[PDB]
Fold:
Amino acid sequence: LHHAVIPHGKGGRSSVSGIVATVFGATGFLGRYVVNHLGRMGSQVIVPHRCEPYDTMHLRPMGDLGQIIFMDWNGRDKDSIRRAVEHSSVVINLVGREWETQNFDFEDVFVKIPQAIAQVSKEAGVEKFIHISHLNADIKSSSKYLRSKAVGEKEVRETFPEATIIKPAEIFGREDRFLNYFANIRWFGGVPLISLGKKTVKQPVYIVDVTKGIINAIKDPDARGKTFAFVGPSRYLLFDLVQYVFAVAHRPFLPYPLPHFAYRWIGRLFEISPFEPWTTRDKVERIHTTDKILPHLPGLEDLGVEATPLELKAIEVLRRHRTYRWLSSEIEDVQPAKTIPT
Amino acid sequence: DTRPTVRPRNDVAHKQLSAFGEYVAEILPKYVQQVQVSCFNELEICIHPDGVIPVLTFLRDHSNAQFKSLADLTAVDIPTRQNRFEIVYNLLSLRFNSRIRVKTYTDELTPIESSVPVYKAANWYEREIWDMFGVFFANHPDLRRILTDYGFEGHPFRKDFPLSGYVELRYDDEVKRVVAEPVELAQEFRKFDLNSPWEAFPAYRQPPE
Amino acid sequence: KLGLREIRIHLCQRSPGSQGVRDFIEKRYVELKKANPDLPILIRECSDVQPKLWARYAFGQEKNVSLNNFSADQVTRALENVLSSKA
Amino acid sequence: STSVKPIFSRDMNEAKRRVRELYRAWYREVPNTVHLFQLDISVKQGRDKVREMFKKNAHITDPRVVDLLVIKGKMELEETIKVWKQRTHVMRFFHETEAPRPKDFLSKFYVGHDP
Amino acid sequence: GVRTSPTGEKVTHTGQVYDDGDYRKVRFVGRQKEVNENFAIDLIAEQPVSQVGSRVISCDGGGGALGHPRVYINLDKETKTGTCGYCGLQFRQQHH
Amino acid sequence: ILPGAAYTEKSATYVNTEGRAQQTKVAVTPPGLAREDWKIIRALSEIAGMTLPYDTLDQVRNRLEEVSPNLVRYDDVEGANYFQQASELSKLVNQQLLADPLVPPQLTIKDFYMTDSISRASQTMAKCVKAVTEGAHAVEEPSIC
Amino acid sequence: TRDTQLITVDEKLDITTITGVPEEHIKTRKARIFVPARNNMQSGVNNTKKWKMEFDTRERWENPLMGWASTADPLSNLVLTFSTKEDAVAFAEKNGWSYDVEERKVPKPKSKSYGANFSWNKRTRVSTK
Ligand SMILES: NC(=O)C1=CN([C@@H]2O[C@H](COP(=O)(O)OP(=O)(O)OC[C@H]3O[C@@H](n4cnc5c(N)ncnc54)[C@H](OP(=O)(O)O)[C@@H]3O)[C@@H](O)[C@H]2O)C=CC1
Ligand SMILES: [Zn+2]
Structure:
């Protein structure tokens, strides 16, 4: 170790952790939690960003003076990638959209870019590479999002053979687009569910647990070269999950079955949006997709993280979807969701 | 008084304050332990802590005293004493245009009678002493922290309390609130040794042990 | 194996309680060392210590025998029990 | 010299009566605290914390020290009841952001020089 | 004067320069390393030596009260020049 | 290689040529990953399933008290005795002296400066050795203040 | 005499619970009670009059940005002054700190004679003034 990247201090803000991390896609849901945890212990964080600097301001208080550094980069520009990794010992990729844009499609953000990041990261002598894929990524999935996750996961594994790949379930947290997605369906009256959500099982994982697992994967030598599956403790039917959301929010729950072909057409309609689609055809597939059971892969308990129940953190996410009448209701008021015994 | 740079001495005020000092010691022998006047003419009455209310009431209400205003009430921490805290009352007599100082002592576990019955100014001054020195005042209308943060642990003005304290605050995005963490400094406060090894004031030289 | 490796005798230079141990060392210690040429018998003194006899066998096990207010004869037996019988 | 002015309690039985009285007040107040401050903790968690804070001082035997801890305990109760404290002040008891620090020798040996 | 490393980084007048493997040179990416370019060691050497006709000369730095404290320099050694301990000007005795 | 701490970086006990016990204090902590010397051995012992019965500095000094009580009496010289007994055992073997002259290891000042690892690494002792073997010609430095 | 109506507490004074100090800075800290040694560079002795209490030195490290000396020790600059060793010890006991006391080092009286510098048959004669 160079004399500068030797840990010092007590793991606090002004300590030196020895980690120098380049975090791609640090400006989204998962990125802010990752950068927060790296900055807590005293890491040097390089945050390359495509967006306006105003949209990175919430990251500034996450690290001591000098510790958070910001760079501009373009996902199709290899020289911008190199400037941002050449000094780092770990490179974390959290780049992704849940929808397609005129400029960047699922092939570009989940295959082209992660592999360009992986190729440059190895040529620059980066020791650790961490790639975030998806639990349900498959070459034969009816979600173009998940088929692109599968193709990119293989390219990343070939470009950076020592890459640690983390496959999380659907992540819930204050900015998740998962339990906030369901709680925002109230704006349309009832809740359209395919097969009434009785044929779909989900295993959501808490954001902090995903973040803790990522941080350990950096500091753990064994994690290198492995693929992990980050999943929650319990498995729920989609119907029971969505019913639990509406109970925590104290909203009226009126689920009605909607045929797959129709609910596809609703997705096509919301995609015309030139901003951020409320829903897309792909989001329909992913939500109504049974979360895989991958026993051969290691999980959070291996990295040392205890998965947090959805029943301890749902009020945290869903209290802002209540009305004044129910704001003060407490975590014990609602019935726990029925869990599939697995 | 004709040395341009030397503060002149007011012998008349020294004599008057010395006389009034004996006067207070004659009337209240049960509580008065020491009386002294400084070279710049400030009278001090040192008392047993039981006499706070009797001594302060006599000074406020006696007709040859009439110290109607409590200018200040504070505490000094001296760790080398068994009674480490020195409670100081500074009083003003508008009738006679005089100030007097009354001092007493206590330790961590001993209460001092609240002087709110004599001066209503003392209410906040005692809350401050309780908060910064941890001296309890018995029979206070409401004793609680006044200066430190809610839930703050310790009494910062004790000489053995660290300058930067034990906890610092930051805003943590994960919990979306201000959190308290153990204190770390990017630059440690630099302790300077300044005391000169050569004696400066022979008149105050203490006797050899 | 399981044999004695070392002996330590702790005693005070002047205290009455150690008077027994001092007499032993003056008279009988020389013979003891000549009898056991290779066993290290460490007589370490220090003012105001309750005299003791530490014995160290193989693999770090140790035993302590008080000698407070013993007599030179008793000290001899105490050493004999250690030298002869080895755990 | 052992004669010392009492703060409140004349012996450890009078002091422990005030400890129990203060535990009842804190025990009753936790449900209201979780409600008013809108804490995500459970009422069981809050009562386990109150209990924990009461075990830290379980070894004391000086009536005057016991009285001060009770005086400080009642001061903290008032700040909570009257909502002088804020949510950040209530959640400082739970040290939610402080990462766990190793207790054993080897883990402590690998990180640094602290005993 | 200003030198550069094989990595391209400028070396300051104190000799500081991040070495090849130090990650701390990331703070200059997209920005610049601020090095003052007038090395006082180079500038004080350009000054001519002053020939004086006495054993002892005094320097106050120039400008009177705007210089440094006045000090006296012994010029008996003829194998070297007298140097001001404050400003670095050099003096030599003129073979008297 | 297991890095340790120099005498300026730990609180350690040393016994001088008189048998006086004295303890240093930590001035600065060890550099890099270096650790205290007795902690490395205590850490190694645990890894080897041979854990030692001490985990703090006070406990490793209670152990020193069991082996030799004088090692924890700081600044106190504990006198020894029993010289008569020591001489008696000395005579038994009767070894034979040699005819070599008694030449000390250090004869001139130049052998004094660099004698252990700390002084061998010092560049000041390096200039001291140069000065006493080569004169002031190559050791001089221009000094102005 | 004093008539407050007093109790009798026979326990040792121990104020750790009521001081607000975190746990790790009482159990693990060793205090040093000592009279400071005279600075050898000077002959003044007025800084060797009082007893001092200081705490064991803990890690300082280099700040990544500026290179300043960073610390996580809240007691690094803490020094207390006492008149006697018994005063210093009592303070450490009630605060629960373990301490190692060091007895005062008093310079010994020397026999100085100016006339000895010119002795007739002794070695104390000086060859220069
Ligand atoms: N439930 C979940 O959230 C789950 C997420 N994942 C994966 O985790 C990773 C993080 O997801 P999350 O961060 O939550 O999604 P976000 O949209 O919250 O953040 C995604 C990041 O991707 C960046 N990004 C997207 N497209 C581009 C582009 N073309 N060029 C550059 N940057 C781009 C965005 O930057 P900007 O803000 O500048 O557009 C944003 O910072 C993704 O790979 C996602 O697939 C996997 C399983 C579950
Ligand atoms: Zn000059």
In short: The first strand of chain B starts at residue 32 and ends at 37.
